[PDB]
Amino acid sequence: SHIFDASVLAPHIPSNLPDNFKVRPLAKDDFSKGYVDLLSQLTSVGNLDQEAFEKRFEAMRTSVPNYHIVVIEDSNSQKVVASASLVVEMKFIHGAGSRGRVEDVVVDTEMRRQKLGAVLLKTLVSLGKSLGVYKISLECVPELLPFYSQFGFQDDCNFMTQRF
Amino acid sequence: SHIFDASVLAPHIPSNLPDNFKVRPLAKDDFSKGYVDLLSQLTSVGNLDQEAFEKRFEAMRTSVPNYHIVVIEDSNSQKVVASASLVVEMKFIHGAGSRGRVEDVVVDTEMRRQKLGAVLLKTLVSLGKSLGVYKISLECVPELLPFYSQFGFQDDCNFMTQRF
């Protein structure tokens, strides 16, 4: 069970990259392949157990637009070592267009500088373009502007937040 | 008919608003109350005609999480004069939490400086708190930082975009 149809993803996955990496949608059994621990490296996972994972996974799976949560399993360890998400918001502006957002980009602490992050970003950009979104966006610290610039992004206006 | 359940919105609507003004969900017949012209003051509406508007309305009305597109009608002109959207993304982070985003804030040019924008932002923040979101965010030109800081927002990291 994949969180979105792998056939949607197949055209956008870059050609290079070694085996033993599989780029694919998030699978329901990725909880048992270390997905929470990977997400912990990005921010707090709070109280997410398998059961809450599975319920959320199903809620996302049956969403349209899909949650395009794309992961990289390293076949050796049977672990998920990178994740990045493209989520899409429907709009009335731009001819009832849609806006893409890249979220929750994480590459496992032991597996950086192996182009895992670049592969995910290239894949999501290609996917978003193909899905027809008029604009794709993301949020990062200024030190990552040159990272994401590589994939066609450029610094835009202010981003404001508040937490509860 | 309403894009989401008005009883969801009721607790968040401020008391004491001039009698001519009704805060409520976007309604399918708002196309005939100038909603496209209102949106055009924000940005391009592209080829949005009634059929496209209705078809998109229905896709949004049936979405869970809902699209909380809140508008204010001037019932003395029977036109929608202001709109703002709270949209919600499901997450696995933060105990399968959710993120709220404030989008497409527009107040008719002739109806500015009458607090409509503050009403809508006050309402959406209150709504988003009550929905349980862990973080609400928005994007704006720097000139609007002190505007949106009134509703609890703070300048955060960078926001990067790519248009297709």
Ligand SMILES: CC(C)(COP(=O)(O)OP(=O)(O)OC[C@H]1O[C@@H](n2cnc3c(N)ncnc32)[C@H](O)[C@@H]1OP(=O)(O)O)[C@@H](O)C(=O)NCCC(=O)NCCS
């Ligand atoms: C940021 C992150 C997503 C990048 O993922 P990665 O898989 O380690 O990145 P890569 O090693 O694939 O880097 C890919 C390309 O980006 C370039 N690059 C990497 N980081 C860069 C950066 N921060 N700024 C500019 N270019 C960068 C590299 O030169 C490489 O290109 P190349 O193959 O042409 O030389 C990941 O490392 C990461 O750490 N994520 C968590 C957040 C974090 O630590 N951010 C850094 C704090 S500033």
Ligand SMILES: CC(C)(COP(=O)(O)OP(=O)(O)OC[C@H]1O[C@@H](n2cnc3c(N)ncnc32)[C@H](O)[C@@H]1OP(=O)(O)O)[C@@H](O)C(=O)NCCC(=O)NCCS
């Ligand atoms: C900004 C906007 C969304 C909403 O507001 P509006 O209904 O016109 O709101 P008002 O001007 O009536 O302001 C409401 C409150 O916020 C305050 N406010 C407005 N702008 C402010 C600012 N820039 N900084 C601090 N407070 C501000 C007002 O003083 C008022 O406070 P009060 O009731 O305690 O006195 C609306 O004016 C708009 O869409 N404008 C077009 C976009 C725009 O101006 N972009 C910036 C280009 S530089």
Ligand SMILES: CC(=O)N[C@@H]1[C@@H](O)[C@H](O)[C@@H](COP(=O)(O)O)O[C@@H]1O
């Ligand atoms: C491009 C990218 O990966 N951006 C992420 C965002 O998607 C994630 O939700 C947040 C988690 O941090 P938080 O727990 O403080 O909100 O960090 C970054 O802004």
Ligand SMILES: CC(=O)N[C@@H]1[C@@H](O)[C@H](O)[C@@H](COP(=O)(O)O)O[C@@H]1O
């Ligand atoms: C808080 C707010 O209203 N932000 C809006 C955003 O929601 C809207 O989608 C975009 C339209 O501009 P665009 O057509 O250039 O993307 O403008 C602003 O960033």
